[PDB]
Amino acid sequence: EVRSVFPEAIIIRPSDIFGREDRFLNHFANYRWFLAVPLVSLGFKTVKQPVYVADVSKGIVNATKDPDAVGKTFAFTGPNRYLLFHLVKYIFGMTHRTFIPYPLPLFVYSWIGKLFGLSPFEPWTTKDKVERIHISDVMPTDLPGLEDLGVQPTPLELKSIEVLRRHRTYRWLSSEIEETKPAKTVNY
Amino acid sequence: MWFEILPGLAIMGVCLVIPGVSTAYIHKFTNGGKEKRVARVQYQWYLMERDRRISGVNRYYVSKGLENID
Amino acid sequence: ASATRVIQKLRNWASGQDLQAKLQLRYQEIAKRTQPPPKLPVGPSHKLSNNYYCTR
Amino acid sequence: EMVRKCDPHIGLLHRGTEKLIEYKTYLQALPYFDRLDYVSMMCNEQAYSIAVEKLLNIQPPPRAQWIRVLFGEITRILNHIMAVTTHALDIGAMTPFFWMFEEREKMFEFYERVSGARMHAAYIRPGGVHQDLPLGLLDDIYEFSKNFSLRIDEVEEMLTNNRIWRNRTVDIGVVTAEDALNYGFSGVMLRGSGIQWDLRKTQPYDVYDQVEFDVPIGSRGDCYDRYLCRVEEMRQSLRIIEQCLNKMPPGEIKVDDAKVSPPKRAEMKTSMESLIHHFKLYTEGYQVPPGATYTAIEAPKGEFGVYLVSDGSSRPYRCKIKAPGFAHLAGLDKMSKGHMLADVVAIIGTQDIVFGEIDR
Amino acid sequence: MFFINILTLLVPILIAMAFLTLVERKILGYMQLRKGPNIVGPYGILQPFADAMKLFMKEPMRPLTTSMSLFIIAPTLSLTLALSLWVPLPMPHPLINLNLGILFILATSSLSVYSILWSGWASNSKYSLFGALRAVAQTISYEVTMAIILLSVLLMNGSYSLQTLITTQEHMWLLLPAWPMAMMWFISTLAETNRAPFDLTEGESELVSGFNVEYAAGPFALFFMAEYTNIILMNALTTIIFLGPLYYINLPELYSTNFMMEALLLSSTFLWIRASYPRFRYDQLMHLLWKNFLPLTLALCMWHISLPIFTAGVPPYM
Amino acid sequence: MNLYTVIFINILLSLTLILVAFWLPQMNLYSEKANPYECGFDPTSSARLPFSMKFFLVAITFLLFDLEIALLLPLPWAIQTIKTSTMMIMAFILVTILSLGLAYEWTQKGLEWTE
Amino acid sequence: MELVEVLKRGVQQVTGHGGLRGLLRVFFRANDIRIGTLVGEDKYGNKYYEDNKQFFGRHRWVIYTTEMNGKNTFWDVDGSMVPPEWHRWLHCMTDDP
Amino acid sequence: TYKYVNKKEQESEVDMKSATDNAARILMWTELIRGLGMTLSYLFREPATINYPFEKGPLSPRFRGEHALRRYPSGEERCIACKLCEAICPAQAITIEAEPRADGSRRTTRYDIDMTKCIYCGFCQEACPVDAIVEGPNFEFSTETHEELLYNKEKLLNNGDKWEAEIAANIQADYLYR
Amino acid sequence: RAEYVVTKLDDLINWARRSSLWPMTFGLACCAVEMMHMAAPRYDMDRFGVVFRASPRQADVMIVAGTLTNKMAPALRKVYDQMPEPRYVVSMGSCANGGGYYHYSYSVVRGCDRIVPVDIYVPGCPPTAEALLYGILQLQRKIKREQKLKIWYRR
């Protein structure tokens, strides 16, 4: 519809954006309030490359100043693609809480998401949220991105401590980056 | 002036009068026009239990007098 | 200033000092807010003569 | 709870006041001194004004000098009220703070009547005094001062014989006279330790040499003796206020030199030389002849000094401000030996500390 | 009917402490030549309710470096101990009649000290640690003094109950027989309630807020409710023990009224003390108690041991 | 049973109040908000270091005096005894030796907060 | 005696603001019950009473209008709702209304 | 001269009556009871609190409040674009861009006063040769944004037109002193 | 009608938050001297229900009263951040408003709004205690105008 009305509109498609007060890293870190981590197919066959907020905002500002991008579509992705299981394991490693995963089928997980989404306030999670969690990212092949919009994509292993340090206890609050091993990066 | 504190003082006064008066009245209502009949010792507790058995309605405060004896 | 005699006696006895003589609220002894216009004096060197600036 | 070392980091109110002063003219740099020690505004104004007057080789008229002494003792009462009551507030009692701050509000009303502002009254100037008193001001000052000693008596009765206040202040922060001289305290800690020194008696500047008062002298060098010294200085300030009200002379308000003081507005609007001098004083300012002076004034917190260096233009080349609180807070670590957190708070209170003058 | 009795004890006490906050602000203001709140209510009577609603609608703000379990347990513990301490008081008939009422009072007060200590240690901050250690010192001193005072006074009394105190003070107060014990008990109740002069646990000037410096609104309101409830309770216990109200078997309403008047007078005396005096140092409080009150109360405990023996005035067991 | 019910009602009231306090308002939590306070600067230490209290001897003396209190507390039932002379002598001896211990500690500067 | 005279001035203040509705209006708007000499009634509706028996500072006061420039100022009383001439009189720069 | 504040002259020796007096002072807390009586007297005094928005605090005609640009009785603006108020402004809070008007009079086109930069010292109003800029009595002009305190010539002329009934009276009451 | 009930509930919570305003015991300079002159018996903020609390955890509004130095600014930001959520800022005086007399200094933050979001600006140098009380009441009206429950209900 935006293409039809405004034919030269820049369309920016980021991945699941991470950062402070996000709903991705903070969501997976807030999985600690329950018994286990209910992932679909144990978090495998689901590939994500999250992108930093400063990278996305810098891309938007470079798009509104750029001589090109007069109708182009950009794919704002992170530099590394992770499996969902490895990403959640890295998140709980940086949080230093614990990590017990749990295979949960998507049908009953959507039921639980609808149960959580039945809320007059801002819901903690919903069916659409768990569907977007368990939808894999696509490979950005022909679309331009942050690299040719002039933004170096900052890795999650670099800008991850500023998000997940809230969710640690006092015992593990003063831990550096090197205390957590980085997640395995898949290619696919 | 200084008498401006008297509304708050009077509210505190009624809120301190209410609990003791209410406790005494509730004790009277529950014990049938008499006091609580506190039992500091086993003799007083035995008197209360004997009164409860004597009354027949399983209430120690129902006092039985000379009308039970012919 | 508008206090009863009993309250004044209680205040004086409790303070140990006489309070009505030097109470810290101003009632009428202060100056009127509307004042007559002033006529400020001129100082020296308004002499119109023997008043060269090199001598002062 | 015992204090092993004090290290006061300052500079969180440092605003480059000396650099701004050297970037502005003398009349433009005057209201910075209202904000150096913002409890004794007229006192800092008097210090800066006497420094500029000494550089200019002019003297304010006698009425201006008597008004400056009257408002100097008014600032002294304000500052000692503030010091004593906030010291007592840090100790734990707040009713003297409220009572003497009602009195402080009356004196701020006096400032607002003599000038525009209640606090930063840019009133005492190198040309004597900016404006003359309104016609009811002396009578209202008398009405305030005749009732003021009762308030000091109420605070004195509340604190002085109180055994809790005595246990909190006696033998706390004891400074020997030699250590006070070596640390360069110079203001109230000297007379609290017994050193007979007061600039108003030793190096008098205004008509302080012809007013009569006493300098309270301590004998133990502790917080209690300093508190007694401040209360007695309030009483002697009341005495000087009475003398100033009696001996106020009928003269002009500023030095009759239109190349230093601005002329009256009527003369400015009717005269050519007066308009020229008004224009030049309010655009360029008066040229101070080159030279350096150090002018020290017995401010209520201590010896307040201005080292002024003039290069001959209408802007000061250098203006160093010597604050007593700088030396006192430098000496805070020495006074806080073998004490705890609570008496360290007491020592901070007993040092007359404002951080505007310390940081500048 | 017993739950109705619990409500008629608990709800008036909470309204009484809220208006104690109002009365404290107004009395301190009028002793400071100003007013109290007079805008929120008709005469400021809605000010504690506005304060309570604001505190319970601000966020509690759990901190990072904080033992959360103790951080949550401590204020609820303080409030429930204040109400549990309010339970056994007779006016003139208690809700719960205990034989060892004074011992129950002492145990509950010590547990309230534990609530303060656990809050101070759990809120992992230096000022909270300072407040907790000051609470430790304060409760050492007043605990030993209070135990001796109550021992001597209840030796003048019979058992450890409080209806026995009513029957003892039926004819005359206990202030006239033991007024030095009453003075030391008043000072000890100040120390127990952590009130001025020697508050030293929420010291606004030496510390920032003491043990509440990390407690945001909510549990902070719980701590405040517990403190002011303890203020009213210590004054109520003082007037039951020492300033014995008039008791008549036919009507207890005049007993309740006399108890109310004397408790209000002693609460206003607490606010009066706060307006009048500066703060002690917390080592000076320990020195003052252990060097002035403890020898004098040991001697007076010995005197009250000897007194019924040589006067033959030994009180009855019941 | 009555006292048990009142205790549980007070505990449930305090729990209800803190649950209302935690579930009623709006939460916005971030790191600088939940950092420890330390008067507007980052704390140098971890607030779990040794504190080195200065009244440790007074605390141990408080333990001993609290047990002397526990000894002295059955006096209201002790004065009901049939002998009363050995009772009076024993109470005098107990209070006297407690006072002698306090006096000896005061003389030996035990309660003086050695820094 | 003095107490009965205080009570007489109190009942005068209570029954001096018109009726019960006027008493409640001034008591819940201005938070005081006082009787002063009317000297004001400006064009916007502000009242401007005075009483020289009171001390300096409380001897002049204004009861604000309930409506000014379309704004319902029944509860939202404002310090800037005073026109400049009554502003000067109320801040006591002159003794002349 | 000087005096001692804590030194005592000789001693009052030791006497049974003086010892009993000191003992009663220590034991009966006499100075503490005296302080209680003092604050009780303060309780029974009358408070100094004014009812704020209805009873305003007293002021003076010299009071420095909100700035205003005045006019002649003919309605012509008093300001003649002479810039010496911004020359004397110690905070550099005034900007006085100017040009000849359509009738050839020397007037201002931009007269900005930054109230967030101004120190409220009255140097502009005491430097102005035509009494154009004044500091009138308005002090209740607090705003909810920083930008509303960045005044321009239209705002200053509006303030002058608003407060002229009070500013003129204050200048009438004050001008003989200045 | 849910709109009427939500509006009245929002008015109730705004009344509570505006009748119980607890500023922090935090000042910097001469403007804080005027702030405690607003605490003085004349213009009794405690009569208004406004009472200082030392800890930022028990504070509601930061009255930035004084010159915000560069060395001071991290402390002010940390102290503001440590407040609980319904927090307000009253800048007071020319220094906290826009730097004031020290606007061109090398060490002064040109206005505290560069550091913290400011709700109410109070002009003056110093503003009178009456003027600061005016700003406090204007803040009370500003948070009386807030409609959080109604915005939530139409959200």
Ligand SMILES: COC1=C(OC)C(=O)C(C/C=C(\C)CC/C=C(\C)CC/C=C(\C)CC/C=C(/C)CC/C=C(/C)CC/C=C(\C)CC/C=C(\C)CC/C=C(\C)CC/C=C(/C)CCC=C(C)C)=C(C)C1=O
């Ligand atoms: C020269 O150098 C300088 C200084 O050096 C001297 C400085 O200092 C300095 C800094 C300067 C400043 C920061 C200035 C600030 C001002 C001051 C320091 C002085 C002002 C005075 C004080 C701070 C002392 C105040 C004294 C008082 C006596 C006031 C009383 C205050 C209190 C906190 C105690 C009273 C309590 C309260 C106000 C709140 C009580 C209420 C509650 C907590 C409510 C709780 C109740 C409930 C939860 C009840 C609920 C239960 C129910 C059943 C209710 C039912 C409800 C229903 C809805 C039905 C500067 C910059 C400076 O340059």
Ligand SMILES: CCCCCCCCCCCCCCCCCC(=O)OC[C@H](COP(=O)([O-])OCC[N+](C)(C)C)OC(=O)CCCCCCCCCCCCCCCCC
């Ligand atoms: C509950 C009923 C009412 C109680 C009183 C309530 C109203 C009065 C309140 C006053 C203000 C209290 C606020 C807190 C004050 C804290 C300071 C304080 O009190 O310190 C204690 C002060 C301490 O004084 P101090 O600390 O200054 O002492 C100096 C000591 N050195 C030098 C070692 C530091 O006083 C006491 O300790 C006295 C306690 C009471 C003594 C009573 C003795 C009565 C007489 C006995 C018998 C005499 C005759 C002998 C035999 C004759 C036989 C024929």
Ligand SMILES: CCCCCCCCCCCCCCCCCC(=O)OC[C@H](COP(=O)(O)OCCN)OC(=O)CCCCCCCCCCCCCCCCC
């Ligand atoms: C936030 C967690 C809080 C946890 C701590 C709770 C503290 C509660 C308050 C302090 C209690 C201190 C100890 C008091 C013990 C009881 C005192 C007493 O004397 O009890 C005896 C009494 C009857 O004895 P007597 O008076 O001789 O009567 C005989 C003839 N009339 O009466 C009796 O025999 C009644 C016996 C039971 C009384 C106590 C009941 C306590 C119930 C458990 C509370 C805690 C539960 C765990 C936590 C729950 C979840 C938070």
Ligand code: SF4
């Ligand atoms: S009052 Fe002073 S700082 Fe303000 S605009 Fe005028 S000259 Fe400049």
Ligand code: SF4
């Ligand atoms: S306001 Fe006055 S001083 Fe300023 S430019 Fe205009 S005429 Fe000149």
Ligand code: SF4
């Ligand atoms: S604006 Fe003025 S009064 Fe306020 S802090 Fe700055 S210099 Fe001081």
